[model samples]
Target chain A: SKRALVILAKGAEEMNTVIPVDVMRRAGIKVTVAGLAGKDPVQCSRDVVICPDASLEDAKKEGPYDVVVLPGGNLGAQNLSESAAVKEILKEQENRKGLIAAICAGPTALLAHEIGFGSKVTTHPLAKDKMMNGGHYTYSENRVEKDGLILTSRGPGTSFEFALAIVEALNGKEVAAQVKAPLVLK
Target chain B: SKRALVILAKGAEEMNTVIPVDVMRRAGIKVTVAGLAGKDPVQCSRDVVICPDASLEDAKKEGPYDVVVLPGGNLGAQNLSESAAVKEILKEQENRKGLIAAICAGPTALLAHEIGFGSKVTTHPLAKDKMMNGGHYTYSENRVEKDGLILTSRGPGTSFEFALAIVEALNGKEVAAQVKAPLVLK
Candidate 1:
């Protein structure tokens, strides 16, 4: 089954963090929420704790996934960027030509891994400079941008757009359209 | 203590789901992860099952929390929306001035509750129309939008921006900036 790996961290945005998981699964993609510490209840910026299906180490060892997603939330992005394990995951995905999607400061982590090279990306307006300074990126007003397998977006407002874009990329616009219909989404 | 809730459903996107929870905790926010039906090991859209902190029922009874967040995952959203208990919880939240946030199609559930009415909102491109029909919405590429007490975003790609915006909304821009600075986010 096609699977996605969602990296968990403390202080991550609540909605921005999970919307894609919902949209993708609606599209019939297998998604996994992996906690870094294997905590039963992982906390969010909104003080919400999420229980991940598996720990990062466990999931990583479980095998390769079709896509890996990173959601950003203040220090969470920084934390993810600083993690040796996360960096290694990025490298593996890059090497495999798999989908790597990030949002807001989440993209900064990718930049830290030097994955932003020649990639068109976007992030929170406040973080725009960091994105540019950290790596090569082209800015766009569009909610989501895709540079090959790497996808980026501005913030939570772009969450669904970003997910839809990824859905289009992974399953084709047609399938994405079906899911969009109920919501009357374009 | 100021607290936030992160809602996790089966098949949620990984980063969008976890990063916000991780980042907020790092920012010193009390974050809690709740599963729809007290189900253990909630799966991400990519097929990863994460353990949940508390069940929806527990959160509702114990919560009078500052905010309730809904993460995105098609399957998760479906489960959440279909859950009579979750819907009741959403309705209760709406009755109060408590902050409510949703990302991607997660907002669809919010919209189904008619919470989007006369508010600036955004979601995945595909679901925009239905969201608009559900309420008065202004489409913007902004990562996060604040319409009264309601907040919304597009999907996983915007998790960080969404999370940061929520942090700012709850804690203050200063706290948000502090978190951003270390990552060179702003």
Candidate 2:
């Protein structure tokens, strides 16, 4: 089965976080929700608390995953931007040409880490300026944008599209459609 | 502020549960994620663990809430259906003419608990048979169906619609529009 790593940090958008994790799992991926802070429950942007499957310290040792996911919240992206551990993980993922995915403010972490500098990306409209601070990456208004291994998307409403795009990348168009149908998506 | 009670149980769809809880909070509703089986972390149907804000026993004491939300997963809906506590809560909410919302398989609980017998409702396509067991309620194919105070939605795909309807019910169209704008919904 394919494997995924989801980095969970305090103030992460719980919608952005849970939607992908649940949807990916429904697609038959083994997803590890690794807490950036530690193994304790992390408070999300909207104050919803989510317990991580494992601490990042422990999860990273098991990586070279099919994809690494970053869920977006302004504060969560800031935390991902500041962490040495996150920088290392993202850098390693990029170096090995593994798929890297982020949504909403999450793409800002990609900008901060200098991972996918030339790729066209989209984010929660509010975070567009921050992601384009140095014009490092091209910006698009599409709901989900993918340039090779780096995938990006807009905010919560576009989460299903973002997650389905990831499923298509790792699995295939057929598997992605199979997973999407039961969702009764519009 | 308006308040909502979201009953959480093991096997609940984490996407269905968290999306509404997070979105409702985004809409400025005082949403409570109450554990049906005490205040322990609930292991959702997809294996994602979510920590509830309070136990159902404790949360019910604070209610007469504006809305009571039920999120769906097969076994999660089964748990909600079998609970004596859930029956009482839904019954009281109905008697007092409060809004009751359920999504996917969650609406089957409304049938099991005998809460909304004659209203129009919709459920995940897979759950249609279970929801219409006795042909007690009129069924609709709409993404989100609201007949009076009882609101029913299709599946994970329609959670935002379900939640926004709740926000509109409590706050109004303007607040729902304000919240919907930032989500970048397609």
Candidate 3:
């Protein structure tokens, strides 16, 4: 089974965070929701509180995951962009040619860390300009956009597609299909 | 402002629980995620942990909310189905003519509590048999089926629609539309 790391920060978009984590687990991926602050509960953008499985400090020791996920809320993405710890993690993940997936404002962190600089990506429409600040990557309006090892997606509505794309990349289409069917997706 | 009480139980579907709570909050409804067990963190079916705002015992004192929400995982629904506390809560909500919203396997709890009998409803496809055990209520495959004060939805995929329906009912179409646009729902 593929292993996944989801970095959760205070103000993280709860839908973007929980949907991917839940769907990936349904696809049989081993997902670790690591809090950026600590092991304590993190308050999300909408004030939903999610208790992380581990702190980023502890989870880093168990790295080399199949995918590293970044969920987006404006404040949460800003925190991710400003973190030295997050910078190092993304750089190492990119250096190893591992998949780094981000959604909505999340792709901004990739730009902040200078990871996947030339990949084609997408972001929540409101986040497009911030992501394209330096023209480091090509942009797409497609709900979910994947270019090589860098995967990106739009806002909350696209979370399922974004998550299933990750599942397909790591576990293949069959597993993704099996997981999607039970969700009763339109 | 309308207040909503979301019952959080162990083994609940994290996506089913969080999506509605977050979306409802976006619609400006006052939402309380009350733990069924206690004030402690509840471990969802997919292993995501959510810390509730208060215990159900305490939340009940707030009483007669605009809506009471139940999210579903097979085990979570079974727990809700068997809860004397839940039975009392739903019964009181029904007696007061307040809205009761449930998703996925959640509607089965209404059946178990003998609430909203004869209302048209829907549940996760896999949960239909359990929900229709006695043919006590009519069933529909609509993504969201709201009849009078009883609102029911299918599975994870229909969560956004279901949540928006609650927003419309409590806050009105304008508020629901405002909340919907930012979600980037296709």
Model 1 per-residue lDDT tens digits across residues A150-181? 89887755667777887888889899888766
B1-186, model 3: which lDDT tens digit per residue?
899999999999999999999999998899999999999999999999999999999999998799999998999999999999999999999999999999999999999999999999999999999999989999999999999999999999999999999999999999999999988887
Residue-wise C-alpha lDDT for candidate 3, range A8-96, written one tens digit per residue: 99999999999999999998899999999989999999999999999999998999799999999999999999999899999999999
**Tens digit per residue, CA lDDT, model 2, B1-186:** 999999999999988999899889988899999999999999999888999999999999998899999999999999999999999999999999999999999999999999889999999999999999999999999999999989999999999998899999999999999999999897
Colliding pairs, model 3: none
Rank by lDDT, highest first: 3, 2, 1
Q: Assess candidate 1 and give its lDDT.
A: 0.74
The regions of model 1 sitting more than 4 angstroms off are: A184-186, B1-186
**What docking tier does model 3 reach?**
high
Interface RMSD, in order shown? 7.5, 0.7, 0.6
Error of 2 at A35 (Å): 0.3
Question: What DockQ does every candidate get?
Answer: 0.16, 0.88, 0.91
DockQ of 2: 0.88
What does the TM-score come to for chain B in model 2? Answer: 0.99
lDDT of 1 by residue, B82-111 (tens): 777767777777888888888777777776
All candidates' TM-scores? Answer: 0.59, 0.99, 0.99
